Design a protein around this ligand. Structure first.
Ligand SMILES: CC(C)(COP(=O)(O)OP(=O)(O)OC[C@H]1O[C@@H](n2cnc3c(N)ncnc32)[C@H](O)[C@@H]1OP(=O)(O)O)[C@@H](O)C(=O)NCCC(=O)NCCS
Ligand SMILES: CC(C)(COP(=O)(O)OP(=O)(O)OC[C@H]1O[C@@H](n2cnc3c(N)ncnc32)[C@H](O)[C@@H]1OP(=O)(O)O)[C@@H](O)C(=O)NCCC(=O)NCCS
Ligand SMILES: O=S(=O)(O)CCCN1CCN(CCO)CC1
Ligand SMILES: O=S(=O)(O)CCCN1CCN(CCO)CC1
Lengths: 245, 275, 259, 259, 245, 275
């Protein structure tokens, strides 16, 4: 059922200048100052390959420089045409770290909409976003890192502790278990759980409430929150805004 | 309505020397080492004007220097005469507070915020900086309205909120500016406990009694231990300050202070280098 | 009825002289069991207990084949059937802050330390639980209580500040200021207890958790623990984490040719 | 021969009752002079001295037309002609860590505080110099000596840790551990003294520095001080700096319409 | 005298793909794994305009992604054809902050060669570089910020304190005085003073010594030093390298 | 050559219980509360092998637990029999040290490094982590050779160096791996003072005597105050640890510990909440 898909086609318009995208879709809301950036490889659980990261960075960088956009919804398209499964981003198949810093530093609120599996790099992308809304039925959080020799020792991990605390964060990474939206909400990494079909609708509601406030204030607030854990980099961004005033 | 008001008149006595207060009430408990500091402008949702801050600072400063007070209950009087509505503090009066925040943060006493109603804008930030928070189940309303008024508390009000509810929730609270109940705020970690409106202060007094029953000193050291790392050098200065005080009252310190007056060498012989 | 299954453990060779602590090595998995062995006094620790505890944990730290340490308390008390993980300190270099050294040992060892709260966890005992990487607690008997201030004492380090990094500033301050008693479930809700388990299954679940941890890359787990510590341990945390990066670079090619 | 030029200063109205501290406002510039006034005892401070010092500095902090505070010591001593900025503390709420409050006042006021070391700067006096934003010292008479440990006391806050942020860990540890006496030049080489000046010119140079500071944007100077503090003052530093950003946003358009 | 110019023409080759640069010059050393990035607007004291920043970022980004380059020499061309004066970068005429983060985060050592005036934004660029060598005769350091309402409250200022200490750093910014290479070396912001004509020669010597060591080790070391003051961002970069090993 | 050796044999006595040391020498001063710990492999530029680290840790651990020792002098014996060259420590033996670093960092005693010769690689990092450093004018040679051997000390050896000489110099020292003299290192801020080779230990003993003449406790508190903020929670734990010890010996603590045994209420009445 197309009506059961999180994507509300009539609410979006393709952003001009990105017809060449193959691994990522990029839309601009018809009314609100909100864009939709999504992984477009459902056939492979929205895993990202070097080319996917290139497009992801280019898209987010453009949203960052769009004066009329105050909120970015980051999600994954689906379901998989191959097995009907759902995925936000299952991780690896420039670098993905650069994408994380882009989300972290852009003066806009980035809301991650976990519509399905969020594993490995995909999970870390969710953690670094400012807010997260997850599908009650299909969101699945699993930190894949420890199993393979790799691991995300920065925002991916350390920053997770700043959301769910040291005990839970260590648990999530050390055992690599799979968690639902509700469990992750209880721990503090998911702001709210929503019905799958409503995931983006709720996301749009959240973005509308955010855009209704002072853009300047929202910008200052984000860097005030970052300033904490980002040391001199955080101070530079916040101070940079101060000087702008 | 009297018995249903959070305020228990028989448990408090006005603090001498503050009859001139107009925007704040200041009471001392009849038995315990606990005071009650409350916003006294229910008609305007306990919003604060410059004069309110002046009194608030003066009152808290006095509580800070009261050797016999170990706990401060910060709340708001009510209900509102105009509409019978309740409020702890609706923030600035749309007609300095940061100094008040530091006062609550640095005083060597536990400050418990009793959210009896709306806690918005500056009022919400005051709750966040307090050491503990108890909230009225029926009327507590938390709302960070800074952003839609073009303002923002980029320090204790916000950053420090993340140290209580985590980065995701804290950003949510500030970015959307939604209204939350005592129970929701308790689930997120910013409210220690929910209490029935009429019992808010009774429970607060219970909490204050349990705190005052322990070693004053220990409590004081503990507060600065908790403050220490988010407050950097300032936190170290306060904690270390408590440390130099403890050292001053030791035999080794007695010696060395005595050896100085007698123009004679100190004798550290009696004191082992503990490891 | 008892959490301890004698069939899954073997005494560790060389520690037959222990009196206040028991030390076992799992029959199959790379997991050890370190437990307070003074149930008669609610597993409170005296200087001798700390000496043995440090010696045991230090040995586990240096055991190349051990990836997980289960820290718990034996019981019940023969006197009254009660249960306790550790009730804290037993009420002239006799002023050695030795328990602090134990905390740092748990904090710095390149292995995951899971605390299994089978009963009362008070004072120093409570702080030991807080510093461990993970905590599983007995639904029926786990009791958390920070009693320090009552006696005029206080753990102003990992016992308190670090608790705030698990349950947040409001809850941590509450736990210490009022010194109330909490259940496994309440502590789980606040964020200091990873999971609640039925008393009799406490160690079984612990072994399950340890097996899942040991099934992954030892190297990765080690790096991850220091990544998490790096956050609050400043230069010390950086030293431990950097130390591991160095560990890797030693087995490298740039590192081989040029050397 | 004396650094103090009576012609450049006017007493601040309202402080005629001061006994241990002098407080002047410059005849032209937005600069005040706050000085210890107990030369007979090497400008050591007693509880009363701290009370006045706090009151004076608090007033300077709230003076909208003052951008720079010169903190020094009057002299010489009528007893022996010696010179001193401040020799520290004069050797039941009588146990008030009031001098610490003075430090925080200097640290938090939105004005540049320049310490003018005209003589001995020992113990608490030395720590006061360290916490100031800038320091100018008398070539001939400035003497820096951290004496705390001799008496078994110690400033484990801005007096010591913050010194390391100026001269580095090695030198800071040296200064405190040995408690040796240093000249203005030596302290300048290590990084704790901005510039050395001839004794008689000390305040003249100080006024020059204050004039150059006052000639710039008051707003910018204020933001800059908190930017530098933000580094070591954690949340407190963030609060002060963020507080200033808020100050700006209040006079803004988004801030006006919507409001 | 062309021989008295810091630039040693025979030691450099233009990097392919950058003929369109107008405000910046970009060369690759004939032998060593070192590049030369320089402000090319001597007529205006090498001040930067938005276009200059765009080119600067593009050039540095390319150097960052060049596997065979281990060191970046950042300087300013001169002298001014108009007055014969010298300048590295006199400051403002994407954002310059992004350029700072690029220098800060690239896994290569960036050496700033102050051949003349380093003021305002120009001064802040020097501070954020890993190492600094300055012309004895013409280097002039002046923090312009406080005078105009602007100020660089991040790396520009805070980070300066991590090099010269809090007293000197506050002095430099509060009074905005002009300092020589030697004075700045005494305070700790300049690694070494060199004769004007030898500035780049010495820089090349320093870069050769740096390139002679393990690239991997140098990379780890830079992030170890950054990790300090960069909070989670620093941890992410360092951890990112760890995982690469 | 005897009188010109930094080592003054008449000032030291072997520490009992360490005759089996082969790579390290360990002496106790005849009068002062000072010990001497030195690398004893001059033939190989005092490079350390696993066995050397084992002994070094054991020796320092013992000094740490010696109630009568307030200062540790860490140096290297010499000259080399092979070529008469001098060295404090050339680092690892190209044939755990981090634990030794933490031991020096955490012991409640001042550790002064006496660089009598080459201080390279691990040897250089050991000097950086010591509280103070004195260096031989004629033979001290500092060189961070980590990078050209494909290795690196990414913690105390490097990051902590920046807290002594600043970020620019620290990066220079590590990135280029150049050799520096005592005087150059003193100018940058990593060497407290330069001394004539033959007087290196004499000056070190002078420094140690001045340190031991003050309050042991104060010195101990000061060291942890300095360590406190770069060491995060670990630093707080050590400093706070010293704080809980001081509190334990107070009347208020006596009470509350006594009230507990007598199964009777504590009485905090006598103790004011200091502010
Ligand atoms: C927090 C908040 C939602 C209160 O809930 P509420 O019952 O819906 O509040 P209302 O705004 O309808 O009404 C209350 C009164 O409190 C006053 N008040 C509350 N917060 C105030 C503030 N921050 N500044 C100035 N006045 C304030 C209102 O001006 C109003 O006064 P009036 O009735 O005499 O005109 C709102 O005050 C905000 O701000
Ligand atoms: C620090 C350093 C420059 C010493 O200065 P130097 O006088 O020029 O040193 P050299 O390398 O020529 O000579 C000294 C001896 O010390 C030994 N040595 C010094 N540092 C060593 C180390 N880190 N690992 C192993 N052996 C080491 C050498 O192997 C050599 O032994 P040998 O003469 O018995 O063959 C060099 O040891 C490095 O490393
Ligand atoms: O201490 S930190 O600020 O780093 C992280 C806060 C600890 N908390 C984690 C999870 N809850 C969030 C609500 O479940 C509260 C506090
Ligand atoms: O304390 S910090 O690590 O932030 C900065 C170091 C302080 N120093 C500044 C300048 N000198 C460098 C040599 O002039 C030594 C230490």
């Amino acid at each position: 059922a197309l009506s059961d898909n999180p994507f509300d086609a009539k609410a979006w318009r393709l952003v001009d200048g990105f017809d060449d995208l193959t691994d990522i879709t990029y839309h601009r809301h018809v009314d609100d100052a909100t864009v939709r950036v999504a992984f477009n490889r459902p056939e492979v659980r929205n895993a990202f390959r070097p080319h996917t990261v290139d497009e992801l960075y280019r898209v987010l960088d453009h949203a960052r420089m769009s004066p009329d956009v105050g909120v970015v919804l980051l999600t994954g398209n689906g379901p998989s045409p191959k097995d009907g499964g759902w995925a936000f981003c299952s991780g690896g198949d420039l670098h993905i770290l650069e994408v994380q810093r882009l989300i972290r530093f852009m003066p806009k609120v980035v809301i991650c909409l976990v519509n399905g599996w969020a594993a490995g790099g995909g999970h870390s992308l969710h953690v670094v976003c400012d807010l997260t809304l997850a599908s009650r039925e299909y969101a699945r959080f699993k930190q894949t890192d420890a199993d393979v020799g790799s691991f995300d020792g920065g925002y991916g991990s350390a920053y997770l502790a700043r959301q769910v605390g040291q005990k839970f964060a260590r648990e999530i990474f050390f055992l690599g278990r799979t968690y639902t939206a509700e469990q992750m909400h209880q721990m503090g990494a998911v702001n709210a759980v929503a019905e799958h079909a409503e995931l983006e609708t709720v996301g749009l509601q959240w973005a509308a409430e955010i855009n209704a406030k002072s853009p300047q204030a929202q910008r200052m607030l984000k860097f005030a929150f970052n300033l904490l854990d980002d040391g001199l980099v955080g101070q530079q961004l916040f101070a940079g805004e101060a000087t702008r005033l």
